[PDB]
Amino acid sequence: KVFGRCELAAAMKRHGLDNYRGYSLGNWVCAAKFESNFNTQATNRNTDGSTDYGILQINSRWWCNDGRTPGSRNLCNIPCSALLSSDITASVNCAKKIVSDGNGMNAWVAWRNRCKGTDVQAWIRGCRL
Ligand SMILES: [Cl-]
Ligand code: NA
């Protein structure tokens, strides 16, 4: 599923991400935009052979199991394939655990490089929430 900007904002708000750990909704929408272009089916392989999955490009190195990242962890205790669903619940629950682990949203390289210190509120402008 390729979300619309406001559709995703509403879905994220409903799942508890607005101001989660102090991160306003615009941050999450911005991150999703540049990580996956709002596509729940986005996958990308890293050089170390791990793979990023779904709307927020969660990494198999630490967070999910894909059966092919030897010596990795599964901290969200889910198959990585569950992160590709049109239902974003699993991606959101896992993201809450990542953003809580001490490094905040800096765990998402595109957020750090493309959202952080910008006017993220513009990403939810005009949306009915
Ligand atoms: Cl933080
Ligand atoms: Na893993």
Instruction: Tell me which method was used to determine the 3D structure.
Output: X-ray
* Residue list for the binding site for substrate: 101
Domain total for the chain? 1
CA distances from 77 to 60, 87, 93, 108 (A): 11, 17, 11, 20
Q: Quote the CA–CA distance of 106 and 103 in Å, as a whole number.
A: 6
Ligand 1 centroid to residue 114 C-alpha, Å: 17
CB 124 within 8 A of CB 25: yes
CA dihedral 79, 92, 1, 112 (to 10 degrees): -110
Give the ligand at the shortest distance from the Cα of 51: 2
Pairing of strands 51-53, 43-45: antiparallel
Strand partners, 23: 20
CATH number at residue 84: 1.10.530.10
Ligand 2 centroid to residue 25 C-alpha, Å: 28
Ligand 1 centroid to residue 106 C-alpha, Å: 8
Host domain of residue 3: 1-129
* Coil vs helix vs strand at 71: coil
Q: Is 35 a catalytic residue?
A: yes
Instruction: For residue 128, count other CB atoms closer than 10 A to its CB.
Output: 6
- Reported for 85-90, long-range contacts at CB under 8 A and 24+ positions apart, including other chains, are 85/40, 85/54, 86/1, 86/40, 88/8, 88/11, 88/12, 88/15, 88/40, 88/55, 89/15
Q: Is 7 a catalytic residue?
A: no
